Amino acid sequence: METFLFTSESVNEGHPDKLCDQISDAVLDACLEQDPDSKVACETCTKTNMVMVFGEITTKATVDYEKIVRDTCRAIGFVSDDVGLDADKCKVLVNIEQQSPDIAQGVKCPEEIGAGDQGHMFGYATDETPELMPLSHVLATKLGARLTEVRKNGTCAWLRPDGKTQVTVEYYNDKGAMVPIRVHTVLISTQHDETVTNDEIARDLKEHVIKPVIPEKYLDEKTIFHLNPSGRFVIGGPHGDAGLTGRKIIIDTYGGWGAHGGGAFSGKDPTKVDRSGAYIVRQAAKSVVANGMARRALVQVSYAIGVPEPLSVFVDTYETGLIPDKEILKIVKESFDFRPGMMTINLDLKRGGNGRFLKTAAYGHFGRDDPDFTWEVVKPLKWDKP
Amino acid sequence: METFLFTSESVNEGHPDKLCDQISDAVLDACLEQDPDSKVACETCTKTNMVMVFGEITTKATVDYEKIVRDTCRAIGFVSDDVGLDADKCKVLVNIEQQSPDIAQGVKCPEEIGAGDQGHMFGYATDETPELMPLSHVLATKLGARLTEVRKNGTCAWLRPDGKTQVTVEYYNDKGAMVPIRVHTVLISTQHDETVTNDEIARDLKEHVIKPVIPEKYLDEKTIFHLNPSGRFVIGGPHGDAGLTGRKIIIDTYGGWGAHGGGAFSGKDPTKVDRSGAYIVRQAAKSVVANGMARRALVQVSYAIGVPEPLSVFVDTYETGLIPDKEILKIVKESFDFRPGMMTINLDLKRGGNGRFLKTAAYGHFGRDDPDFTWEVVKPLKWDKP
Ligand SMILES: [Cl-]
Ligand SMILES: [Cl-]
Ligand SMILES: [Cl-]
Ligand SMILES: [Cl-]
Ligand SMILES: [Cl-]
Ligand SMILES: [Cl-]
Ligand SMILES: [Cl-]
Ligand SMILES: [Cl-]
Ligand SMILES: [Cl-]
Ligand SMILES: [Cl-]
Ligand SMILES: [Cl-]
Ligand SMILES: [Cl-]
Ligand SMILES: [Cl-]
Ligand SMILES: [Cl-]
Ligand SMILES: [Cl-]
Ligand SMILES: [Cl-]
Ligand SMILES: [Mg+2]
Ligand SMILES: [Mg+2]
Ligand SMILES: [Mg+2]
Ligand SMILES: [Mg+2]
């Protein structure tokens, strides 16, 4: 059998760029919990002993930006200078242009309102896992989530919040469909305390992290493991390693599979097409595959500022479609409402009080079963069987 | 003929995120001009009346970070609050951890040194344009470059630095190769002064910008034009619109085509595999197509921190290869040196004094003919003809 190697990575919730995504979305969630119509463009950056929140917010909400920063950092585990940031003592620069909504005198609706910006977004799905995501991405991501889990539940209390994971999968191409054969290489680089030995780290990573996450059918005697290959990782988080919102957009989506239109998600209210548009095209690609039309699907949408209807839509099934891609395009266009105001309503994205967006801001926006991930709910599609 | 629509965008050099990429790379260039061995991880952010440079630099160079910020902003055209940032008067926060190199007492080499980080990178090429780039990306990008050109040479002196462009191309798929048929939709949203009328903007955009850039063979009576569709754009740049380094990574690469591994380029010295690795795989994909092995090619490489050899390589020719992809993979692996220390040397990336990286930081890292873009020089590949 002819195979090829495809790699995806993940970063842990303590990585300084991901920290910024989480802070940005914790701010967004706080705004929406009080004011579903909040306009939010909240950017975060961080470096040694400092977090700055910036950007623009128009809201009726009363939000303690500094407290959200500190609470978000503390819950991730940044409780001291030694672990890479002291949530209680670090500098927090609050640099947001805060506005209340416009006051106007006079006597646009979701059906007619134009996009708030131009741009393009892609959705992807593949039948190679039950959540219709690429296995290389799923496994890298799940290793990261597992590192967080065993640190917070005390199973591996030697762990610290920062770290990275990476999985190389050996694939076969079946008529355009991606068929995972085996895991070729697993890499973990995790932050840890100054007492645990290299031997304890390697044994615990194998037994508490890799073994539970990676199906045994994909592991064999030849699988390569790189476990903290560069040696010690005691220093982490923002300490000596600046972070910014929107610097993990491939980890947030499909891990190199599919495509990306460039726009980050975190800190953006769900009227913004970079977020709602990307979520709708995930729902569309996932629905094409789940309804049986194809084994794999890529969907693009694009917008112009001030225009409600998309400028373009395509569908590509990588030759796996059971009906022509032009027919799948017609069905997608008829079944999905790509108008900006309508996307936000149909995915129930303004609904407050469930911490929805902070949940998205680590360990991927796609492939998760939580009911707040409304874009993961398949839409039933009618299709003229071949 | 069966066609589909594919969209790519661009932003102008005055867009606040792109401003940050340019500042970050102007800092990098200044470091390398004096000290080719500089370690640079320079991040920039901006908001109304402020730029902050941050991150980490180890260098022997003496660099006036604030002066580089102001010079970079001024040359782009940010000369007043009215045009979106006053380069001479705005706040510049210098927040870099500056170090000199380690002082050590004792009696690694490029061949043996490990990658500085993990991650994966993709290269792409396509025979649909002479520079072996996707037409949707090339045209969006060239419209942006043209807007800058006619503003700076006074042809359209009403222009201001910020703006965005977007092109939808109608394509045909010929045996996996992408064949552009026509331009379906052109969008331009440009910043401008308070005197020019909407009619003058639309006429000058058509005649001075669109007509010279887009080959007439791709334009017809049905092509849709959206010219400043949301109305006036007098306010721009950082004014009310926060920017950050590394938020335009799809514009920096392939416009939705190919793939992306996630890592930004700007502000990173060329020992960093996110930059050198991505540049080498562009050279490899371009070389596969230019040597006649394929019409289209995608190449991935991946790395582990502390390991010199890549963890994985793949090649995909989208069924356009004239020899099997496994044979093209063998040729690429034999012909290219993917070791981090060697990539930097073979692409001559430390060479100082030519403003190389600032040139990359607007209007795309790929598809340009300038001799400093060493990764655009095709390597001759020997291949066992079919
Ligand atoms: Cl403070
Ligand atoms: Cl308002
Ligand atoms: Cl509108
Ligand atoms: Cl928007
Ligand atoms: Cl300790
Ligand atoms: Cl360390
Ligand atoms: Cl369309
Ligand atoms: Cl819908
Ligand atoms: Cl200042
Ligand atoms: Cl040093
Ligand atoms: Cl090394
Ligand atoms: Cl690196
Ligand atoms: Cl004016
Ligand atoms: Cl305006
Ligand atoms: Cl390989
Ligand atoms: Cl080489
Ligand atoms: Mg308070
Ligand atoms: Mg980073
Ligand atoms: Mg000075
Ligand atoms: Mg932005």
Side-chain angles (χ1 to χ4, degrees), chain B residues 23 206 307 329:
Chain B
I23 292 166
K206 288 187 286 283
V307 179
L329 177 65

Side-chain angles (χ1 to χ4, degrees), chain B residues 66 70 89-93:
Chain B
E66 176 171 351
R70 299 191 184 284
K89 302 300 183 49
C90 67
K91 186 185 313 214
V92 177
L93 300 175

